[PDB]
Structure formats: structure tokens, C-alpha cells
Write a protein that binds this ligand. Structure first.
Ligand SMILES: *Cc1cc2c(cc1C)nc1c(=O)[nH]c(=O)nc-1n2C[C@H](O)[C@H](O)[C@H](O)COP(=O)(O)OP(=O)(O)OC[C@H]1O[C@@H](n2cnc3c(N)ncnc32)[C@H](O)[C@@H]1O
Ligand SMILES: *Cc1cc2c(cc1C)nc1c(=O)[nH]c(=O)nc-1n2C[C@H](O)[C@H](O)[C@H](O)COP(=O)(O)OP(=O)(O)OC[C@H]1O[C@@H](n2cnc3c(N)ncnc32)[C@H](O)[C@@H]1O
Ligand SMILES: CCCCCCCCCCCC[N+](C)(C)CCCS(=O)(=O)O
Ligand SMILES: CCCCCCCCCCCC[N+](C)(C)CCCS(=O)(=O)O
Ligand SMILES: Cc1c(C)c2ccc(OC[C@H]3CCCNC3)cc2oc1=O
Ligand SMILES: Cc1c(C)c2ccc(OC[C@H]3CCCNC3)cc2oc1=O
Lengths: 494, 499
């Protein structure tokens, strides 16, 4: 019934906000639509897998907030297997390699690839993390799709196909669906291309022992009966002295303040009194989430390691159901598994198939890329189609179509009276990730502590000391990477 | 509590659905979120204006369903004033003209303008009205914005700027916001560029005497207590024998079937049990409505007519708050008024101002465009910003961003168990208009009459006899219009000749 703060959503962001406010001595209630906490994180347990992350899973260096919060909750990480060679599958053939980027041999293709990645970072350097709409060319970049940018930038079909896979994998959307400005901000706010794509020393370095679901479950353990499961919020009334929050099961919660810790567009599922201001009313109809099926095939052994493959597969072209895989084997070498993403339009296309039809297609693909008949002998399969989730809207995160970030981006974390806005979408560092969820929840919680006079304005945004367990190594480039000309550059010299 | 059909939404679509079901002897309830019917139609009455349409207003030739429904309810139409000259205002100067398109004198520019409109209509003939995703190049056209298409098509800035204003005015969105496939579908399903842009012989020919709001009000009069105002629907449950529909004021309705007659994205405001199928679940997060403020400035007299201007202004420029106006004077010649639209990004930008500051900007623009100091002497002002409507999401209608119509378009009007979809967005002729609202409402009602075994499948889709009151002149071209080359075609002819 009555409390200091109602948090809408029991994901990492809502749970992080509620823990900070509870630790500061306020009475918090978390209203959660599902029969579970964790949202876009979900750990399934069974005897066949022990545990598997079917939603968010990976953490890496520079993600210091999720690493600190998890360490405090008693969680440990292990390294994603990258001891042996990565595979680039192009034109029906496997090319094993080492290092984060697949090698390119044709000298014109080399210049075009090198220029693509370098240009993404060059453009990112002019985009403020906390205000991408303040980029000097914000309207020019916001009014084109990543498809138009790649058409201008990529002189080779080779580079244009790899850059397309890169967009699809990063933001689970087609190049023609997303703003160039938003995508370039998205990469820049994760620390750039090398950091976002890397396993070793990047975003995919590590997983949590026992699953990422434990972050939200263990915060729920701390809060006890303050977390209300199967309480979808339907109605928020800010006309009276206290804020009133109503759930679908007809419960009424009364608070001084509300944290909205749900994806922006899921704001549409709530009736507001008074109506939302115009810009937010329209913004929450304009910000979809991407489309992905996460698929884990289990094997008796990590057989790819015998051929000096780590299990990472980068798979070009339309025919492949999965464009990208990682070794999902447990640190002990047991529960051997390959994790694959069915991305964007393929998620929509292959959703029509049965679970068994998807398994056969994945196994046949992996047999070709790994060059082993052992890929045809799976012992177990798990998958999750995030497109079908009423209380997520998709995965991994919210993308901005062309024109939306410059016109509406400012409204994303603007408070509406006594509603403050959390969720990974409102973060300024690793927005879209579990790290962003923690940044946003803690910031929204501290905006309410300041509204209450408990902390000064300069304590709303707080830096995070570096993890001792997962330190970041510097991102380096070579002299040639920095100075080799583009393809049009090599032409102007001829 | 119990009925045959719950209709969610008391706009024109839901009320047309409800009237048809009621006339076929079913028990219907209409659950309307607002304290009024009409939705994106709203007629304000006060002593200063007598009546004014602040939402949908115009009807024209080929909109035979809204004309028939309106006439059955006892309503009359009158013609929007197009007796005197139209104005094209470009680069700070006014160029008066007659006929639907501003004339172009520069021959290269003429070839580019002619080719622009022609290509719009040529591409449109490739696109089936009822399945735009089946166009041969659906994918290629859907992966392009209208901005990219105009950049390829328009060899002059003059044609590009006019084409930009055309998109802004048609679908209240920027060229870079909208799918080229969707926009080309949208124009073609209205009968093509000439029909959609014309006053005389087009979409803007007429208004209802007394306002368009009377359509929804008069159907509510026929239905009595069956219409429930201030019942926003929050929850639909299909797990049991009867469909359960719950409202925000805690009332429960039980029906055999539901028509959803709300903009597609406003389906997000409803919690579904069981959850929607995947494709609809995502589709309703991907289909925003456009942005528009409708502004009516009142004057002592229609002073523009005395300079032989009908009141129609087509105004190019970033600085102009309004890109399009029509005479909104009553048919009696009194309550002299100019209607203008503040479109797309300008609706966002100028919403920051006061009502009085917007009125002042509009009067200054009208003064310059009409060359008239009288435009600075308004007697009254009415405006409505549709961006702020929780239960509309915007106006006029839903647009599709790049990639969405090919991936998700097939599920727009696909039933979900015992939920059928009405609303203008599900129409195949004048989708986005009051006409499309009637088509979709009556089609959805008949889908249910079919499901109940009351009519055969061939009666779900039913054609409409032509209005005898508003007959349609056919859309014609001249030989030159059909066969003049584009600018790149002229350059090809030159390259060939000189060889
Ligand atoms: C799905 C997914 C996500 C993902 C990814 C792969 C997949 C398949 N891989 C990731 C990774 O390897 N590393 C990483 O850091 N992130 C990865 N992502 C994304 C990541 O999971 C998300 O960024 C993160 O989980 C976001 O958390 P946040 O707390 O911001 O949002 P949420 O999890 O969606 O939580 C929202 C909660 O709110 C509830 N909800 C929704 N509507 C209501 C109403 N009306 N009332 C009450 N509660 C509501 C949701 O049910 C949810 O629990
Ligand atoms: C706003 C506008 C529209 C318009 C236009 C100019 C403006 C500024 N000019 C038009 C014109 O000149 N001629 C024309 O034919 N159309 C024009 N448009 C478009 C026109 O208004 C619309 O196409 C038409 O009115 C749409 O009708 P439809 O019946 O499909 O949709 P609706 O009017 O939006 O009605 C929906 C009703 O549902 C209610 N609602 C919404 N959510 C709920 C829930 N959860 N529960 C119950 N009811 C709900 C809305 O309140 C609304 O009444
Ligand atoms: C050749 N492509 C790469 C198609 C265009 C060059 C882009 S630009 O000409 O440099 O804008
Ligand atoms: C050479 C000038 C390009 C002219 N524009 C109209 C800019 C592009 C035509 C595109 S296309 O060449 O017709 O595909
Ligand atoms: C969740 C996840 C992300 C976001 C992610 C984002 C980018 C990414 O890049 C790896 C590829 C991109 C294509 C070119 N080389 C390396 C890999 C990723 O792996 C992942 O598991
Ligand atoms: C509702 C409405 C529409 C959709 C509408 C759509 C197009 C339109 O075009 C007239 C312009 C287009 C640009 C070229 N000259 C004449 C005018 C319109 O006036 C309207 O009131």
C-alpha cells in the first residue's frame, strides 16, 4: 500500500535502483509484471544444462558497475573460451584466424575494411555519450540509415557484408531500420569498435558462474516481500499529493516517487493521469526493440577445441540461420555447448519453424563451419525467442529509427513530475547492456535522493572504480591502421 | 456486462462497425476511453466559431462509404472554396495559379516535376492495395526512406522541395522517417497523386455541414446506452469460452468477439492474455503516428477572395510554421477563417510556444503570403496539437518506417483468435481517412458475421456504389505528360544524338 518509492520493473535496472534506495533507508516496493525477476536476463536451470543464460549473459572490462554489484551479491565470473582460433566463414569456406578482426588478403578489400572500422570510431569521437543529439552533424547522421552510411563508405561488397553483420549482431536490427547517428553513438558509448566486438579485453570476455539471472534473484532475496511478482502496472496518477500506482490485479500502491525501470516503449502499457507531456507521449511509440532468438546446442565434448577452434564462428551471408557463435562450455570443460544468435529478419523468418527444425538447421550449419560430423550429434537444445515477450518487446535493446534520436532523444531520462526513468536505454556507458541497467537504476535512485534533499546535485552521477578482477587493457591501433588510405583516398593518389 | 461483440474505440471505425452489427440484430457495446466519441474527428462548438473541425474534416470523390454513412445519418456536404487562385509561395515570393499542381516554367524543371509525379504513380501501379509487400521490388523499396527515393528521382532542388512538402503534408512525417514502399502504397490506395492532392475532384473537395463529429455522435444516438464513455480498455482475456474485456474503471465485459478499432500502436495500452503472437507483439511497437497542429485563424471577412485568392497557400521554406492552408469560411460566407497545418518536425518545434505566439507567427506568414495587412487583424483562433493525445498518439495516421511494412504488414488485419481489427490503418482504400475508417469498421463487423455463419465469405469485402451527390471525374493525363522524358532520359537522348 504506502511506501517512499515504487519501482516499476524487476530487471537489473529496477533491482539496482531499489537496492540503492533500500540501503539508504527508504521503503521501496518493486512492482514486476512477470512471475519472475530479471527481465531481459533469464537463467534456466535443468540437469541437462545445469544453468544456461537465455537472455543477457556477457560482461567485460570497463563494465565496472555490473562487476561491483555482482561481486557484492557474491557472484564470480569465468572467461569465455578464446584460447584457440576464431573462424570467418565466407563463400562456403572456413578461414581460421587469431585477434579480434577477421584478416583480409586482397589489398583493396584490406584498405576498405580498415577504413570502415576506423571511420566508425572517427565519427564516434564527435558524438557526446550523454547527448548524441549535440553531435555537430547530428541531423545529417540522424536522417540517414546505417544502410545509407555503409553504401557511401564501403567500396567493396566484402566490407559492406561484414559491416552489415556487425550492425545486425550489435543491435539485432537491419542496417535500413536504424539511424546512423544512433548506431555510431551506440558503438562509441561502449568504448568503440574494438571494445564492443572483442571477447578477450572486450564486451564478451566473461559470464557469471551460475548465470546472470542471479543478479536480480539475489537482490530480490535482499528485498524479501518488497518485490511483488505478477503485478503489471496499468495506471499511474500524479494529480494528488502522493503518487498512486495501480496494478492489473487491482492493487493500489502509494508513494512520494516512482522509478520507471522498463523499456521506453513499454511505457505505452500504462495509462497516465495527467496525460504524459506531448514529447514523451509520442517518443514511446517510436522506439522498438530488436529481434533475436538465442540458441544453445549441447554436445558430449567441446570437439571444436581438438581442431584448434575456440568455438567462435563469424558466418557471412543470407543462407546461414546464425551469423555468430561463442563457446558456451562451462569453465570445467563440461556441458559443452555452442551459443548462436538468429538475428533481425532471420529471427522473424525462422520463428515459423519448430524447435526441432531450428536444431537441425543449426547443427548442419555448425558441421559445415567447424568441418566436423560431431556437430550433427547434439545431446540437448535450448532457445528463447525474445520477440514473443509482452513485457520485453524484444532484445537486446531499443533501437532508434531515422529522425527519432535528434527529435525525441532529450526526453528519454527527463523526469515527468515525480516519475524518474531508469532502464539500460537511459544509460550513457554500455547503454543496451546489464552494465547500462546498473548505471541507469543507481542514477535514477540518486535523482530521487537529491529530490528528497538527502544528497547534493554533484552526487547524482557517480564514477565507478575499476574492477580489480576484470581490469581493462588499452585499445591500441598500428601506424598502418591509422594512416593507410581509404579506397577513394588511394584513387585521389592516381 | 454480456453482449455478442465488444467494440474497443468509438471513433468512426468502431461506430461504423457497431452500427452494422446492431443493424444485423446483434447486441454490441462500444467501449470508448474518452468522455466523447469521434476519436481523431472532433467538432468544437462555441459562439465565436459556431462549429469547427479540429481533427478529420475533408471528404471527396471516390470516398463513397463515408458519404453513404453520413447521408444515411442525415448529414450534408458543402464544397471547400476553390473559386479564386491558389498560391505557391517559394523563396519568399507568392505565385498565384489555377489547377491542382503549381505550374513550372523552366523546361528542365518541368521535365523533372512531370517525371516525379508520373514515377510516384508508375511505382504505385506495381503495388497491390491489399498486399503492398507483394510488389515485385517490395524489399528494395521498403529498405529505402522517401528521402533516399527523392534524392535518386529529383534532378532539380525545385522538384525535391515540392516532393518533400507533398510527403510532409500527406502523412505528417519527414521524408527520412518513412518507408518509400509504404508511402507509394499510401498514395496509390487513395487513387494516386492527383486524387490525393486535389480540392476540386480530390480528397479535400468537401466538408460536412455542422462538422464531421456528427458522424460518431449520430451513431451514438442510434445505439443509446450501448456506448460507454470513459471506459479505457486495459485487459483482454481469450483463455475462456467467452472473451473478457476489462476497463480502467474496473468494469468487466463478456462477448463472443472483439473488434479493436484503435490505432495499431494504441493496442500497447492493453494487457493481453494469452500474450499476442510474436509478429503482432513487435508490430505494435514499430508503427508511430505523425505529428500535426491544426490551426484556424478567424477574420472579419474572407478578404483574400477580394484579391482573387481562394485561401489555398502552398508554402515552401523552413521558416514558415505552416506549409499548407485552405479557406475554412462557412458555406453562408460568414465566420471567415484560414485553416493551416503545422507539420512533422515543426509541430514538435512550435509546440514550445504559447497559443498567442503561434497565432502571431501564423498572421505574419499569412500577411506576407497574401500581400495583405488585413491578415494581422484576427478576430479569433482555435488550434489542436494531436501529438498530446494519449488515446490518438498523433494525426492524421500511422506511418511505417523503413523495413516494417515488408516484415510485419501481413499481420495488421490478421485476427488474433476472436479479436478482429478495424481502424482506418487496416483499410485498402483511403486508409488514413474517415473513408478508410468506414471500410475497416464494416469489413471487421462482416468478418464476425462470417465467423458466426450469418453471411458467406464472399460478403466480407463489399464494394460501394458511387455517390450520386459527389460523382468522381476520372484522373486523366495528356500525351506530353505520359511521354516527355525524365532529366536523365533527356541526357541519354543527347549522349546518343551526339555520337
Ligand atoms: C534478450 C537478450 C539481452 C541481452 C543479450 C542477449 C539477449 C538474447 N546479451 C547481453 C549480454 O551478453 N550482455 C549484456 O550486458 N546484455 C545483454 N543483453 C541485454 C541485457 O539483458 C539488457 O540490457 C538488460 O537486461 C536490461 O535490463 P533493464 O532492467 O533495463 O530492463 P529489463 O530487463 O527489460 O527489465 C524490465 C522489467 O520490467 C518489467 N515490466 C515491463 N512492463 C511492466 C509493467 N507494466 N509493470 C511492471 N513491470 C513491468 C519486465 O517484466 C522486466 O522484468
Ligand atoms: C487529426 C486529424 C485527422 C485527419 C485530418 C486532420 C487531422 C488534424 N484530416 C482528415 C481529413 O481532412 N479527412 C479525412 O478523411 N481524414 C482526416 N484525418 C484522419 C481521420 O481523422 C482519421 O483517419 C479517422 O478519424 C480515424 O478513425 P478511426 O475510427 O480509425 O480511429 P480513431 O478516430 O483514432 O478512433 C479510435 C477511438 O478509440 C479510442 N481508444 C484508444 N484507445 C482505447 C482504449 N484502450 N480503450 C477504449 N478506447 C480507446 C479513442 O479515444 C478513439 O475514440
Ligand atoms: C561508389 N560507391 C561506394 C557506391 C559510392 C561512393 C560514395 S561517394 O561518391 O564518395 O559519395
Ligand atoms: C550524376 C548526378 C546524380 C544526380 N542525382 C539526382 C543526385 C542522383 C541520381 C541517382 S541515379 O544516377 O539516377 O541512380
Ligand atoms: C551480445 C553480443 C554483442 C552485443 C556483440 C556485439 C558485437 C560483436 O562483434 C563480433 C564480430 C562483429 C563482426 C566482425 N568481427 C567480430 C559481438 C557481440 O557478441 C555478443 O555476444
Ligand atoms: C488531410 C489532407 C491531406 C491528407 C492532404 C494531402 C496532400 C495534399 O497536397 C496538396 C499539395 C501537395 C504538394 C503539391 N501541391 C498541392 C493536401 C492535403 O490536404 C489535407 O487536408
Amino acid at each position: 500500500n504506502k511506501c517512499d518509492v515504487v519501482v516499476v520493473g524487476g530487471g537489473i535496472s529496477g533491482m539496482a535502483a531499489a537496492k540503492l534506495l533500500h540501503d539508504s533507508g527508504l521503503n521501496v516496493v518493486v512492482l514486476e509484471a512477470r512471475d519472475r525477476v530479471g527481465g531481459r536476463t533469464y537463467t534456466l536451470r535443468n540437469q541437462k544444462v545445469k544453468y544456461v543464460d537465455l537472455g543477457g549473459s556477457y560482461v567485460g572490462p570497463t563494465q565496472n558497475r555490473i562487476l561491483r554489484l555482482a561481486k557484492e551479491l557474491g557472484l564470480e565470473t569465468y572467461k569465455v573460451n578464446e584460447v584457440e582460433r576464431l573462424i570467418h566463414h565466407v563463400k562456403g569456406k572456413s578461414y581460421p584466424f587469431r585477434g579480434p578482426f577477421p584478416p583480409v588478403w586482397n589489398p583493396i578489400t584490406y584498405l576498405d575494411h580498415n577504413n570502415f572500422w576506423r571511420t566508425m570510431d572517427d565519427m564516434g569521437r564527435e558524438i557526446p555519450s550523454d547527448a548524441p543529439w549535440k553531435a555537430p552533424l547530428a541531423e545529417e547522421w540522424d536522417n540517414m540509415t546505417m544502410k545509407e552510411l555503409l553504401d557511401k563508405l564501403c567500396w567493396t561488397e566484402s566490407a559492406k557484408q561484414l559491416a552489415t553483420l556487425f550492425v545486425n549482431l550489435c543491435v539485432t536490427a537491419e542496417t535500413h531500420e536504424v539511424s546512423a547517428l544512433w548506431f555510431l553513438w551506440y558503438v562509441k558509448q561502449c568504448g568503440g569498435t574494438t571494445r564492443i566486438i572483442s571477447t578477450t579485453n572486450g564486451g564478451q570476455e566473461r559470464k557469471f558462474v551460475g548465470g546472470s539471472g542471479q543478479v536480480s534473484e539475489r537482490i530480490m532475496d535482499l528485498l524479501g516481500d518488497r518485490v511483488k511478482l505478477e503485478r503489471p502496472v496499468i495506471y499511474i496518477d500524479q494529480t494528488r499529493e502522493n503518487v498512486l500506482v495501480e496494478t492489473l490485479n487491482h492493487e493500489m500502491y502509494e508513494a512520494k516517487y516512482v522509478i520507471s525501470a522498463i523499456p521506453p516503449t513499454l511505457g505505452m502499457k500504462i495509462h497516465f493521469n495527467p496525460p504524459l507531456p506531448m514529447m514523451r507521449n509520442q517518443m514511446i511509440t517510436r522506439v522498438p526493440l530488436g529481434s533475436v532468438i538465442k540458441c544453445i546446442v549441447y554436445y558430449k565434448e567441446p570437439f571444436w577445441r581438438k581442431k584448434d577452434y575456440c568455438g567462435t564462428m563469424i558466418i557471412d551471408g543470407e543462407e546461414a540461420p546464425v551469423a555468430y557463435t561463442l563457446d558456451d562450455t562451462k569453465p570445467e570443460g563440461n556441458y559443452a555447448a555452442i551459443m548462436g544468435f538468429i538475428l533481425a529478419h532471420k529471427a522473424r523468418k525462422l520463428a515459423r519453424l519448430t524447435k526441432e527444425e531450428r536444431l537441425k538447421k543449426l547443427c548442419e550449419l555448425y558441421a559445415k563451419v567447424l568441418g566436423s560430423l560431431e556437430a550433427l550429434e547434439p545431446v540437448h537444445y535450448e532457445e528463447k525467442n525474445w520477440c514473443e515477450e509482452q513485457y520485453s518487446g524484444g532484445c537486446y535493446t531499443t533501437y532508434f529509427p531515422p529522425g527519432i534520436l535528434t527529435q525525441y532523444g532529450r526526453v528519454l531520462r527527463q523526469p515527468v513530475d515525480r516519475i524518474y526513468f531508469a532502464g539500460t536505454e537511459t544509460a550513457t556507458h554500455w547503454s543496451g547492456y546489464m552494465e547500462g541497467a546498473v548505471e541507469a537504476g543507481e542514477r535514477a535512485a540518486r535523482e530521487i535522493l537529491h529530490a528528497m534533499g538527502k544528497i547534493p546535485e554533484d552526487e547524482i552521477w557517480q564514477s565507478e572504480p575499476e574492477s580489480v578482477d576484470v581490469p581493462a587493457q588499452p585499445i591500441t591501433t598500428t601506424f598502418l591502421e591509422r594512416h593507410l588510405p581509404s579506397v577513394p583516398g588511394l584513387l585521389r593518389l592516381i
